[PDB]
Amino acid sequence: KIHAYTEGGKPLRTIYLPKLLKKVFLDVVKPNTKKNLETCGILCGKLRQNAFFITHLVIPLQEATSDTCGTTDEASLFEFQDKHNLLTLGWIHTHPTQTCFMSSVDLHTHCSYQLMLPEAIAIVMAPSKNTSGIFRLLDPEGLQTIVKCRKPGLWHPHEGKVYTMVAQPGHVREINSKLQVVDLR
């Protein structure tokens, strides 16, 4: 009934996102957001009849500071997804104090997810601003920009528009569905 396309005309399969996930994620990582610490997680799920369903929010082993967060033991993350046949459909993280945008680090991180899965999304929570966003890189121009990029330094800039908010509801559609939250910390 409704189809979304990339900038280059490639069709994106739909990802069904449980309406609950954003709220439960903030709740699960609230201890860190109080301590001014960023947190991340993985959106996992399944492919059914040409559509993706996010079924699991997975909080991986990770280290964080006030402006960064990163995984540390990806092997256990792997073991969980493989054992349960979970596809990686994107990721989520908090900006405890900042605005709702994709930083230079977010873009380089996400480029790799979107390369492995054209529909992959990045959810950004800015709870101190009560905003949130769901983003992807422009396909193909933004992917190509970040893939070619070799600039040093954490916070370096990029030439041109590199990312955008995902199409709703064609690419991502929030629905009332079940969710499992898996905390591996």
Partner 1 sequence: GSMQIFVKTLTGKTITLEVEPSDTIENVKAKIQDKEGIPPDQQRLIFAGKQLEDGRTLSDYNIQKESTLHLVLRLRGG
93 is in an annotated binding site: yes
**Half-sphere exposure of 127 toward its Cβ, with a 13 Å CA cutoff?**
19
Region 131-170 residues binding partner 1, contact defined as CB under 8 A: 143, 147, 154-155
List the beta strands (DSSP E) in the chain: 4-5, 11-12, 14-18, 40-48, 51-59, 62-64, 69-71, 87-94, 121-126, 131-137, 163-165, 172-175, 180-183
CB of 163 to partner 1, least distance (A): 13
Binding status of residue 97 toward partner 1 by CB under 8 A = no
Binding status of residue 82 toward partner 1 by CB under 8 A = yes
Find out whether 59 and 182 touch, Cβ atoms under 8 Å.
Answer: yes
Q: Of 1 and 38, which CB lies nearer to partner 1 in the complex structure? A: 38
**Smallest Cα–Cα separation from 106: which of 127, 88, 92?**
92
Binding status of residue 112 toward partner 1 by CB under 8 A = yes
Stretch that binds partner 1, among 8-16, 23-31, 100-108, 129-137 (CB under 8 A): 100-108
Q: What is the spatial distance between Cα 41 and Cα 184, in angstroms, rounded to a whole number? A: 10
Using CB under 8 A, pick the residue from 13, 28, 68, 97 that binds partner 1.
68
Find out whether 95 and 40 touch, Cβ atoms under 8 Å.
Answer: no
Which residues are annotated as part of the binding site for Zn(2+)? 93, 95, 106, 108, 149, 156, 158
- Give me the residues that bind partner 1 (CB under 8 A), please: 38, 40, 42, 47, 60, 62, 67-71, 74-75, 77-79, 81-82, 86-88, 91, 93, 103-106, 108-109, 111-113, 115-117, 120, 143, 147, 154-155
